[PDB]
Amino acid sequence: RKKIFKPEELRQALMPTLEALYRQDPESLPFRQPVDPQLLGIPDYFDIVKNPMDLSTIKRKLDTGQYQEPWQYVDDVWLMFNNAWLYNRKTSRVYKFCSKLAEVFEQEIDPVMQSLG
Numbered sequence: 001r002k003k004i005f006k007p008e009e010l011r012q013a014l015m016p017t018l019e020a021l022y023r024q025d026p027e028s029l030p031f032r033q034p035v036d037p038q039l040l041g042i043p044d045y046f047d048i049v050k051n052p053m054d055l056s057t058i059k060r061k062l063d064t065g066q067y068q069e070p071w072q073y074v075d076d077v078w079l080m081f082n083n084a085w086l087y088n089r090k091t092s093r094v095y096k097f098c099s100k101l102a103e104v105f106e107q108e109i110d111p112v113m114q115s116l117g
């Protein structure tokens with residue numbers, strides 16, 4: 001029989017992994033709010049990043065039952081990373097900070113995924 005997830009239980013299981021990302025200081029700072037290309041003066045951003053994602057949007061989704069399965073949450077976290085790694089220079093602050101968050105995410109998401117299945 002296939003496992004089905006209750007919204008508050010999926011939120012409780014995944015939230016610690018999101019909190020771990022959000023608490024990285026300074027590395028979460030470029031990711032705590034959506035990229036605003038108008039405010040940052042980068043009109044080319046949405047020509048490269050078709051599906052923006054950031055930590056505040058991931059949290060708002062985890063809080064409002066928008067993830068039905070844990071892998072939809074994992075997909076959004078990787079989308080945030082892959083956007084940053086495509087747009088930014090490899091030794092830029094944003095790219096280096098992204099790679100730190102991805103290290104933290106990998107080290108934390110594995111037991112949670114095993115425990116959820």
Ligand SMILES: CC(=O)c1cn(C)c2ccccc12
Pocket residue numbers: 030031035040042083084087088094
């Ligand atoms: C997440 C991301 O790509 C970026 C976040 N900030 C604050 C930026 C500033 C310039 C270029 C890219 C970004």
